[PDB]
Structures are given as structure tokens and as C-alpha cells.
Write a protein that binds this DNA or RNA. Structure first.
Ligand SMILES: [Mg+2]
Ligand SMILES: [Mg+2]
Ligand SMILES: [Mg+2]
Ligand SMILES: [Mg+2]
Ligand SMILES: [Mg+2]
Ligand SMILES: [Mg+2]
Ligand SMILES: [Mg+2]
Ligand SMILES: [Mg+2]
Ligand SMILES: [Mg+2]
Ligand SMILES: [Mg+2]
Ligand SMILES: [Mg+2]
Ligand SMILES: [Mg+2]
Ligand SMILES: [Mg+2]
Ligand SMILES: [Mg+2]
Ligand SMILES: [Mg+2]
Ligand SMILES: [Mg+2]
Ligand SMILES: [Mg+2]
Ligand SMILES: [Mg+2]
Ligand SMILES: [Mg+2]
Ligand SMILES: [Mg+2]
Ligand SMILES: [Mg+2]
Ligand SMILES: [Mg+2]
Ligand SMILES: [Mg+2]
Ligand SMILES: [Mg+2]
Ligand SMILES: [Mg+2]
Ligand SMILES: [Mg+2]
Ligand SMILES: [Mg+2]
Ligand SMILES: [Mg+2]
Ligand SMILES: [Mg+2]
Ligand SMILES: [Mg+2]
Ligand SMILES: [Mg+2]
Ligand SMILES: [Mg+2]
Ligand SMILES: [Mg+2]
Ligand SMILES: [Mg+2]
Ligand SMILES: [Mg+2]
Ligand SMILES: [Mg+2]
Ligand SMILES: [Mg+2]
Ligand SMILES: [Mg+2]
Ligand SMILES: [Mg+2]
Ligand SMILES: [Mg+2]
Ligand SMILES: [Zn+2]
Ligand SMILES: [Zn+2]
Lengths: 25, 202, 127, 94, 212, 91, 97
RNA sequence: AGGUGAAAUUCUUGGAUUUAUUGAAGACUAACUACUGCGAAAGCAUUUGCCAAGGACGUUUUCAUUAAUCAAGAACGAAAGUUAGGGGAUCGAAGAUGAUCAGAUACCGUCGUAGUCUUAACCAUAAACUAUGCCGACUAGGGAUCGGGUGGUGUUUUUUUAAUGACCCACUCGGCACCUUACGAGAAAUCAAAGUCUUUGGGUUCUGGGGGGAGUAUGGUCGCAAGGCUGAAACUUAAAGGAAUU
């Protein structure tokens, strides 16, 4: 990881964490 | 009605008898009531005129062209459609011209075409959105609607018939030489699957 | 009382073209390349292959009997390289040294009015 | 630390210029930043030329030149030895 | 073993009646059958060559030319024109740093119906007393020059049919008509006229050419 | 006041057919129903009848056009193209 | 450009607008010029020039439609043709050809 | 023929590459081009025409405090990306591939979808940089240059003179900068502002408070989406960092 691809990482993590919520109610 | 292009009743003086002849063109985009239409070899270069193709320079756009001149129009007739003059062989007067489908034909340069594009183009962009809006499209064409897929039928009805699943079963592409009764699917398909690109063949 | 020709030489890298035409060119005569008088691919533009290219070409001058020629050196040009390749000033001093008589040189590398973006990408060829 | 007032090279008053392509590798470099040098090769070779004006027509006359203006990206302009690393003080001239 | 050179012919050409050395050289075609002839295949061609060899002195090292052959003419051909050019070497020999460059083009018909377009180009020059190292022009001058160079060239043609002016250029003349029209706006060091060519493929009207 | 925040003329279709088709259908439902200017009459009163048929309400002058606009991008360039080629044929 | 030479006549001189009114100024030799919007029909064009042929006046054909001419004469409606009766203090009558 | 350190994938006797003569399409604007110009910035370079806009200068013109900087709220905003039309020459994320390599769907080679142009919509981020808020005042020399004005028996321009226009010379206001040098500043690198500060106050807005966790979570909010804007804590650490020296 350097910043631009560490950012790409926590963009994927921030977005998979975002969509796992939708499976629930 | 039934056609997506708009027509155009144009009238001419019959040069061998005192009366008028109403010839019915397909309206190129831009022609209007009251406009004067010129029709012949020495006619000039504005949309709506109809000229032999050896006259118009390389790069014009014409429509309802003749494969053999005098057939009174066979090509580029659909809404938004047209052809392009691409070259002239003057001796052996024939003109090569590229078509909607991307193909290129060579037709006797004496062939008549109509300058411009056919009006009413862009019709396909809007979705039909309502099944009935298609019922009505085809009620003024022919009984070609709706299509029920062969895979829903019993094998007595269609080669795609039968099965305890809904599968074509065997390859759905048919060789051009199949016999009528068999030709249900992708006849003489030189490929299948998802393309990405377009025409201009060689 | 002597006649001429048109050399239209094309000195790239990886190959060298000497090709003499009629001043029209709609009829032209017997090209030889740089790879016809050697077969290596790492030795296709080498001056030693340009002398061999002018050799079997001038030898075919009097194939139905003509004498002399004009010259037009053109590098790759276009969008790419714009500078004469190696076998250029080799293949010329060959047919000068080869008795065929010449004059009036011109550089006709096609140079653009800065157009049609070039191969290599934005970071270049990274070697 | 900042190395040069002209940081990359020679632009103060613009904020943007259009880039040029390196003649060796095709790297993109903004024109002002590029290092331009004139190639005006004589059209004949090292010596190699007296052999021609024998084969010449024309009281010799000939001698035209070539003109390519060369733009080099910084990476290639140093590999090619066109430009070399100067001292910390040696670094401001024209 | 075909050797398509012995079995093929060798002809000649005049292009003009303008200058002195009207005759050229030669080439071949598969000797003229019933059609496929040198009569039918041949003379859809034209030429490209320089100028000093046209009119002698070497103040004229530049200037290629085009030459449109019209019709088959008796083991010869007289080729009118399909335009002309300059040298891709000598232009680069002019455009130097620390000076402005002007460039103007125009297109004109000839009264018959044969049409063409022609270019022109000039640079700035330092006055004898200059110490300003760059001699640049004010872009108002530049378009005021561009406007009046163009006014100078079109002044000639269209009081011209296909041939009528063709006569006029050779002695490097209009460069003085620009000069007397432009030594009040800015100095201007190089003036020339690089490129022409014909565009109309009109009614050939045979009776035209034979003047030459 | 403001009736629909986003749906405009396609409010008739309700929730049927999916948000994006209504947005495609919308764009051309506007062009199809728009009042245009007459090139001859000057008056902003030409709107379409059937597809490609555009009639100035007064001045009664009909012209052919695009299926949903009086003029397409294509025709406007082919108009500016034969007129480009026309000018070398005449001169 | 030349658009601009007109708005001086409006405060200065006097004018009328329209077919039915300028066709009078011509029947009286008192329209010293008429201006015709480009988009006006040619039938009306051809016939309006005939009056200038009889009224002993030449005409300047306008480069815009009835819309652009109205804004040019400084009004908010279509205008086919305008007639100048007295230019008063105006440069227009010299500034022609 | 191609291409390369070297090669291979590719084309070609229905004749490639090369040459000619015509033509078409789409992009781009070479060389001129610079320690030059313009714009608030992002940016802006072939011609001419139309539409409005603009700074500097000049002014013995008018108004007269109308101004400066700014929560909130707005306009524009590279490239990419989104949607839908047109357009698609080229180059070219993905992909196809041929090499290389221990492996190498990587750097190289050859193709190639999207994209690259565009219209109508979004989108609002770039090391959006001078990493230097804006307004105002003062504190050093120098020579250049762009635009403007003045001046001068000055050089070139003849129309028939002159007037302009180009150049020289002094000055001048306003720029893009630059060189010298610091008295002063500073951790230094360096700075005419980063000076006029423990001799600490001209006016004003925004931002930071050890390093991670983290621009994460949660709420809100804008977006169609990608994502933007706002933004913690538990926990964890004696460093992480700047500039210079050897
Ligand atoms: Mg990175
Ligand atoms: Mg049915
Ligand atoms: Mg179906
Ligand atoms: Mg079905
Ligand atoms: Mg059953
Ligand atoms: Mg079967
Ligand atoms: Mg069966
Ligand atoms: Mg089945
Ligand atoms: Mg199923
Ligand atoms: Mg090779
Ligand atoms: Mg390297
Ligand atoms: Mg460093
Ligand atoms: Mg500025
Ligand atoms: Mg920037
Ligand atoms: Mg009345
Ligand atoms: Mg009437
Ligand atoms: Mg061939
Ligand atoms: Mg032609
Ligand atoms: Mg032609
Ligand atoms: Mg400038
Ligand atoms: Mg240019
Ligand atoms: Mg704010
Ligand atoms: Mg944007
Ligand atoms: Mg963008
Ligand atoms: Mg698209
Ligand atoms: Mg493409
Ligand atoms: Mg890959
Ligand atoms: Mg690659
Ligand atoms: Mg490629
Ligand atoms: Mg916004
Ligand atoms: Mg910042
Ligand atoms: Mg200040
Ligand atoms: Mg000055
Ligand atoms: Mg000045
Ligand atoms: Mg003065
Ligand atoms: Mg902290
Ligand atoms: Mg912390
Ligand atoms: Mg956490
Ligand atoms: Mg949130
Ligand atoms: Mg450090
Ligand atoms: Zn490079
Ligand atoms: Zn109307």
C-alpha cells in the first residue's frame, strides 16, 4: 500500500461495509 | 400509416399532355410545402432534388436510390436513412456508393437518387414502454406480433420444443443449407455472443 | 543528352528503401529493399546493407537502358520519428560511388501540422 | 526541500501550457518544461560527400540541410547525456 | 521471366508553350492493345519537378510543379496543369526564433470555370538600429498585414480564366507589391508565396489547350 | 405549486416501466410536444403532428423533420455539406 | 455594424412599420427607404420592390427575420418591413452601396 | 514488409511494404513559441465575420465614502467517470495476445472494447502548486521585457510634403519575471517577502494543536452511480516528521 492504492483499498472496504448493511433490516 | 417515414405528394406538369401528375416521394428531411423540386440530369444541388449520381460530386447524400436506374427507388428509404456517393468510374459510367448497412455497391452512374436524408429519423430512440404501443405499431404492418419463443412449445410445434427444462437442446445455429422446417435459430451464423464495434467491411 | 529518374528513398530504422520511379511514378521499375540484399533482422538498416541495396539497384539501371536519377530522402516522418535512419547517407554515397550520376536532393519526410496523437502512451516507452 | 525556483522549468504566469511528446520514448511533458534542441544535420554524411559531387551534375551548389526541432523528456534527456547533473551552484545558467 | 520492360513502350511529353525546355522524358505502358491502350490507360497521370532547371539560373533552387494531361495526343502528350508547391527543406530554413511569422491564404476562381487556391508567407525584421533582440509584431499589424496581403493577391485573378494569369508569377514580382503596400506597418524580412493547386475538374473544352 | 420533484410529463406513467425508461421517454416526450419557431412565418407556433411532420399553426406551412424534433443534428450537417459541395460545383 | 445606424433615426426621424402602412408611404413618394426582414415571403418581397420601382426608391434588404428586425427597430414584435419617411438627423441615406 | 537488445504475434501473388493520381472521415493546430500574452481559477494558439465582456494607460470628466474582508447562500471548476444522442481518424483503462521471467494476464511488441471529439445532462475532485489568503502602508540596487503615455533638430517609410507606422534615447505608470544583495527574517534550505515581531497590535477570512487508529464508524446531507461535503470514539504509541552535516 501507498496512499493512492491504500485509498483504493479503504474505498472498497468502506463500500463493502456499506452494502452488507442492506442485506439486513 | 404503417411507415415511420413521412411521404410527400409532389406534382409535375406532364410534358406530353395538358394535365398534372402527382408523383409520391418519400420526404427528405428539410423539404416543405411550397418548395420547388427539380428532377433531371442538369438539376442543381439542394436537398429535395433528384439527380443521376454521375452528376453529384464525391460526398453527397442521397436516398430512395435505384439499383438499375428507372426502377423508381429501392434503397435508403427508411426514416433517417441515406447513402453516400464515394467514387466514380466515369468511363463505364458506374458510381460506387456506401449504404446504411455499411456495404458498398457499384451502380450505373445514371441511377437516380434524392439529395439528403429521409425525414422522421430518430424514431427508434424512444422506448415503446407499453406492450399495446407495439400491438398498435404492428396492427398497421402485419401479423408478426407477438412472438412466442419456440422453447415454450411442444416438440410437435418447433425444433426448440419439448424438454422437461426449457433448452434449445442442440446448437441453435443452423447452416445456410438447412431445409425449410429446420431454419429456426441463427442461420449461417458466422459467429455468436457479444460483439463490440461496427461496420465498414472489406 | 541524358535522361533522369526519381529515387524516393525512405531511410527508416529496421529497414532502408531505395525506389526509383518515373517522374510520374504510375509506372515504376524494380525497387530493391534493404532486406533483399541481407537476411538478419538485426542487420536490416545497416549501411553495409544500404551499399548492397544500391548495388543491385544501379546494376538494374540499364535493364532497358537508362542512366541517371533524382533523390528524395524521407525518414519515417508522419507522427513518429522525423529523422533520417542509418542506411540513408550510406545508400546514397553508394550509388554516387557507383557511377550513376545524380543531383538535386530534397527532404520530404512528412511533417504534420501537429496532429493525430502518437503511439507510446502518456508515460512513454518505459524501458 | 524545493530544488529550483523554476520548479520543473520556466513557467511563471500561466498555470498551464500544452504538452509536447519526447522524440525518443513518447513521454508527455509540458512544452515549457521540455528541453528543446535543434538538429540541423547536414544532408550529406561525415566525410562521404566528395564522392558525390563527382557523381554530381551542377557546379557543385548542393548542400541543403535537415531541420528537426528536438524535444526531450527529462528522463531520456539525461540518459542520452544531452544534459548532465550540475553542482548545487553550477545549476543556474542559459 | 516476364520482364515487363522490353515488352513495354517508351514515349515523350511536352507540357507547355510557356517556357523553353517543354519536353521531359518518357515511361511505359503495356503496348497499346485495343483498349488497355496507352490511349486509354495512359495520361490519367501527371508529373512533379523543380524550377531552376526550367529557367536556368540558381537563384531558383526551389519550386515543384504539377501537370494535368488531358487527352491522348499522337505519341506525345501536352499536359496542362494540376498545380504546384515549394520545398519541404527551405521553409524550415527560414522560420527562426525571435521574430513574428505571418501567413495568409486565398482561393479564387478563373473566369472560365477552373478554380484554385494559393498561399503566402512573410516574417518580421529588425530595423537597422534595433537592440531589441526579438523584432516581434503587434498582432494588429499581423492581421492588418494579413488583410492587405490577401487584398493584393485576389486583385490579380478572376480577371483571369484558367490560363490568363498563369503567365504572371514567375519573376518573383508580387513581393514588391506587398512591399510598397507594407513598408509603413512593419519591416517584414522574407516575403514568398509557397503553394497552389487546382480543384475544379470542369468542362475540359478541348479548344483551350492548343494555345500551347 | 411544484407538483413533481423529478417526474414532469412522465407522471402519467406512475411507477410502471422503471425509472430509466421513463427518463428516456421523457426527454423525447418534451421534444415531441414542444412549440417551435417557423423559419418562414417567424411565429413560435410550429409543433408536430405525426412523426416527422411539423406544421406552423398559422401560416399553415408544413416541413419534414426529425421524428421528435423539427431538425436533427444529421440533417443540419448534411445541409451544411451539400452546400459545401454545391459551392465547388457551381464555382 | 450597420444594425446600429437605425436606432438614430427613431429618436431623430419618423417611420412606419408593416405592409399595410409602408405600402402607403410608397404610393406617396414619401418613404425615402424601406427595409425588409429576410424571412418575409418572396411574393410579398417581389411585389414590395415593384412599388420602389415605381416610387423611385431603392431598398435595403435586412439580414434578420421579422424578429431580429423588431429588436433592431427597438420593439417587441415581429416586423416584416419598415419605411423611413424623414431621416431627420441620420446617416443612413448616404450609407448605401 | 513489421517490429526489436534480440525476436515473435500481423500482412502479401485475389500482389502486401514502397510509388503515383484522385478522394473520404475524424481529430490536432507543429516549426514561429520565448524566464512573452490573456483570464478569478480550472485554462486559452490557423483564417475571417458577428455577439457581448475586459485590464493597463491617458483624463484640469462625473459621483462622493458608495469601501475592505467574509458564516449563510451562490457562479465557474483539468483529467477521468456517469446518462442519452451524434461521431468515432487516431491513440488507447479492460481484454486479446507474442515475448521475457522461476512465475510475469507487468514494464517491451502487436491488436483492441470503453474512452479519447461532441451535444444535452450530471459529477465537484487534482501535487486545482507559488505546496505562500485578501485589502493597505513602508523598507534595498540593477538591468531586461510586455502594454500605455510623454518627450526628442535623433535612424528607416514618400504622396507631393507631412502625418502616422518600425527602431534608437530619457522618463513614466502598470505587468510577467529576472539578477545583485541583505540591514532585516528564519531551524535551515531559503525569502523583497517568508522584512517592517518578546522594541511582540493597520483591517479581515479560513486552517492547525504529538504519531497511528481514520477520513474509518455513526448521523446528516448532495449524487443515478462512482462518490462528494460534514465527521467522532474505543483503542494504541515515544516517538513518527522538517532542514542541514559528515
Ligand atoms: Mg502511485
Ligand atoms: Mg397475434
Ligand atoms: Mg421479443
Ligand atoms: Mg417471446
Ligand atoms: Mg405437456
Ligand atoms: Mg434439430
Ligand atoms: Mg421435430
Ligand atoms: Mg427443447
Ligand atoms: Mg427458462
Ligand atoms: Mg524489418
Ligand atoms: Mg530508464
Ligand atoms: Mg529529494
Ligand atoms: Mg494574471
Ligand atoms: Mg494546473
Ligand atoms: Mg392605412
Ligand atoms: Mg401580399
Ligand atoms: Mg501495390
Ligand atoms: Mg475528381
Ligand atoms: Mg478530383
Ligand atoms: Mg504574444
Ligand atoms: Mg499554427
Ligand atoms: Mg462557504
Ligand atoms: Mg467538470
Ligand atoms: Mg471534463
Ligand atoms: Mg455515446
Ligand atoms: Mg473509436
Ligand atoms: Mg494485459
Ligand atoms: Mg503495451
Ligand atoms: Mg494501436
Ligand atoms: Mg456545482
Ligand atoms: Mg492546497
Ligand atoms: Mg502588500
Ligand atoms: Mg514599455
Ligand atoms: Mg511604450
Ligand atoms: Mg512620441
Ligand atoms: Mg493529532
Ligand atoms: Mg492523534
Ligand atoms: Mg475502526
Ligand atoms: Mg454517512
Ligand atoms: Mg530529511
Ligand atoms: Zn523520453
Ligand atoms: Zn409559419
Amino acid at each position: 500500500m501507498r496512499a493512492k492504492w491504500r485509498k483504493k483499498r479503504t474505498r472498497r472496504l468502506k463500500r463493502k461495509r456499506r452494502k452488507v448493511r442492506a442485506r439486513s433490516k | 400509416s404503417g411507415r415511420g417515414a413521412p411521404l410527400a405528394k409532389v406534382v409535375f406538369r406532364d410534358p406530353y399532355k395538358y394535365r398534372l401528375r402527382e408523383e409520391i416521394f418519400i420526404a427528405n428531411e428539410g423539404v416543405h410545402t411550397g418548395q420547388f423540386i427539380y428532377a433531371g440530369k442538369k438539376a442543381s444541388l439542394n436537398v429535395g432534388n433528384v439527380l443521376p449520381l454521375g452528376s453529384v460530386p464525391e460526398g453527397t447524400i442521397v436516398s430512395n436510390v435505384e439499383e438499375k436506374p428507372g426502377d423508381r427507388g429501392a434503397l435508403a428509404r427508411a426514416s433517417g436513412n441515406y447513402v453516400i456517393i464515394i467514387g466514380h468510374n466515369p468511363d463505364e459510367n458506374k458510381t460506387r456508393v456506401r449504404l446504411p448497412s455499411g456495404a458498398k455497391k457499384v451502380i450505373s452512374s445514371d441511377a437516380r437518387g434524392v439529395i439528403g436524408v429521409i425525414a422522421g429519423g430518430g424514431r427508434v430512440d424512444k422506448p415503446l414502454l407499453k406492450a399495446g404501443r407495439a400491438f398498435h405499431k404492428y396492427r398497421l404492418k402485419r401479423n408478426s406480433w407477438p412472438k412466442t419463443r419456440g422453447v415454450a412449445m411442444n416438440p410437435v410445434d418447433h425444433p426448440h420444443g419439448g424438454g422437461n427444462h426449457q433448452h434449445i437442446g442442440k446448437a441453435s445455429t443452423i447452416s445456410r443449407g438447412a431445409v425449410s422446417g429446420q431454419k429456426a435459430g441463427l442461420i449461417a451464423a458466422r459467429r455468436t455472443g457479444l460483439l463490440r464495434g461496427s461496420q465498414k467491411t472489406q | 543528352s541524358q535522361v533522369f529518374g526519381v529515387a524516393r528513398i525512405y531511410a527508416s530504422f529496421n529497414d532502408t528503401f531505395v525506389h526509383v520511379t518515373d517522374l510520374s511514378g504510375k509506372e515504376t521499375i524494380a525497387r530493391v529493399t534493404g532486406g533483399m540484399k541481407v537476411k538478419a533482422d538485426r542487420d536490416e538498416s545497416s549501411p553495409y546493407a544500404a551499399m548492397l541495396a544500391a548495388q543491385d539497384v544501379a546494376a538494374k539501371c540499364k535493364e532497358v537502358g537508362i542512366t541517371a536519377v533524382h533523390v528524395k530522402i524521407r525518414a519515417t516522418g508522419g507522427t513518429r520519428t522525423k529523422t533520417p535512419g542509418p542506411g540513408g547517407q550510406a545508400a546514397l554515397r553508394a550509388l554516387a560511388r557507383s557511377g550513376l550520376r545524380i543531383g538535386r536532393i530534397e527532404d520530404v519526410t512528412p511533417v504534420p501540422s501537429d496532429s493525430t496523437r502518437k503511439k507510446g502512451g502518456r508515460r512513454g516507452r518505459r524501458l | 526541500p524545493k530544488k529550483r525556483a523554476s520548479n520543473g522549468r520556466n513557467k511563471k504566469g500561466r498555470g498551464h501550457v500544452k504538452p509536447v511528446r519526447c522524440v525518443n520514448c513518447s513521454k508527455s511533458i509540458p512544452k515549457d518544461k521540455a528541453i528543446k534542441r535543434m538538429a540541423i544535420r547536414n544532408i550529406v554524411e561525415a566525410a562521404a560527400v566528395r564522392d558525390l559531387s563527382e557523381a554530381s551534375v551542377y557546379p557543385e551548389y548542393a548542400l541543403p540541410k535537415t531541420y528537426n526541432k528536438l524535444h526531450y523528456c527529462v528522463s531520456c534527456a539525461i540518459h542520452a547525456r544531452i544534459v548532465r547533473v550540475r553542482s548545487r551552484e553550477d545549476r543556474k545558467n542559459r | 521471366v516476364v520482364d515487363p520492360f522490353t515488352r513495354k513502350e517508351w514515349f515523350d511529353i511536352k507540357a507547355p508553350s510557356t517556357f523553353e525546355n517543354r519536353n521531359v522524358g518518357k515511361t511505359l505502358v503495356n503496348k497499346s492493345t485495343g483498349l488497355k491502350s496507352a490511349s486509354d490507360a495512359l495520361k490519367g497521370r501527371v508529373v512533379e519537378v523543380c524550377l531552376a532547371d526550367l529557367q536556368g539560373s540558381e537563384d531558383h533552387s526551389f519550386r515543384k510543379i504539377k501537370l494535368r494531361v488531358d487527352e491522348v495526343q499522337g505519341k506525345n502528350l501536352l499536359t496542362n496543369f494540376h498545380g504546384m508547391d515549394f520545398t519541404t527543406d527551405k521553409l524550415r530554413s527560414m522560420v527562426r526564433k525571435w521574430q513574428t511569422l505571418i501567413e495568409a491564404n486565398v482561393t479564387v476562381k478563373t473566369s472560365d470555370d477552373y478554380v484554385l487556391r494559393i498561399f503566402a508567407i512573410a516574417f518580421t525584421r529588425k530595423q537597422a538600429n534595433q537592440v531589441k533582440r526579438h523584432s516581434y509584431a503587434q498582432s494588429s499589424h499581423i492581421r492588418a498585414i494579413r488583410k492587405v496581403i490577401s487584398e493584393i493577391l485576389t486583385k490579380e485573378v478572376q480577371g483571369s480564366t484558367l490560363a490568363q494569369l498563369t503567365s504572371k508569377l514567375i519573376p518573383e514580382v508580387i513581393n514588391k507589391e506587398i512591399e510598397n503596400a507594407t513598408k509603413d506597418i512593419f519591416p517584414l524580412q522574407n516575403i514568398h508565396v509557397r503553394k497552389v493547386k487546382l480543384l475544379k475538374q470542369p468542362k475540359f473544352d478541348v479548344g483551350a489547350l492548343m494555345a500551347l | 405549486a411544484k407538483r413533481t420533484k423529478k417526474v414532469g410529463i412522465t407522471g402519467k406513467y406512475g411507477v410502471r416501466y422503471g425509472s430509466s425508461l421513463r427518463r428516456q421517454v421523457k426527454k423525447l416526450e418534451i421534444q415531441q410536444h414542444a412549440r417551435y419557431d417557423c423559419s418562414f412565418c417567424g411565429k413560435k407556433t410550429v409543433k408536430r403532428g405525426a412523426a416527422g411532420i411539423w406544421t406552423c399553426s398559422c401560416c399553415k406551412k408544413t416541413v419534414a423533420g426529425g421524428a421528435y424534433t423539427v431538425s436533427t443534428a444529421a440533417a443540419a450537417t448534411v445541409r451544411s455539406t451539400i452546400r459545401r459541395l454545391r459551392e465547388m460545383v457551381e464555382a | 455594424s450597420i444594425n446600429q445606424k437605425l436606432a438614430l433615426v427613431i429618436k431623430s426621424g419618423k417611420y412606419t412599420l408593416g405592409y399595410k402602412s409602408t405600402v402607403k408611404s410608397l404610393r406617396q413618394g414619401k418613404s425615402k427607404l424601406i427595409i425588409i426582414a429576410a424571412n418575409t415571403p418572396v411574393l410579398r418581397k417581389s411585389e414590395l420592390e415593384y412599388y420602389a420601382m415605381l416610387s423611385k426608391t431603392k431598398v435595403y434588404y435586412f439580414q434578420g427575420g421579422n424578429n431580429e428586425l423588431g429588436t433592431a427597430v427597438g420593439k417587441l414584435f415581429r416586423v416584416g418591413v419598415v419605411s423611413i419617411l424623414e431621416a431627420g438627423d441620420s446617416d443612413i441615406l448616404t450609407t448605401l452601396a
